[PDB]
Amino acid sequence: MDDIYKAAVEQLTEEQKNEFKAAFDIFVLGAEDGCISTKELGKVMRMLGQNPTPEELQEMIDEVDEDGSGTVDFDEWLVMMVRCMKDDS
């Protein structure tokens, strides 16, 4: 019953869904398997100008997992956005 995530995805635009595919690639640019690891995601935050603890991302990916494989997919990425805007737990 995550309407917030259902509507958030719909409210999106052709540009958003299109750009969502670019970011995923930029994140897994070096990844061989093709998955964004907690370390990979954080590596981008470091060059951005911040320094988010590795305990946050790790716990985040797990909290935003569909099957709990420990990897964020194009789908889990779309929900990760709203999950933060409506983070309660």
Binding site: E19, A23, I26, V44, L48, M81, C84, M85
Partner: peptide, 20 residues
């Protein structure tokens, strides 16, 4: 009634998407 999170940041990595 709120504003989207700071996601545009990563959008600027590629070059500058939705920078404004």
């Amino acid at each position: 009634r709120r504003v989207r999170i700071s996601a545009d940041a990563m959008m600027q990595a590629l070059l500058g998407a939705r920078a404004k």
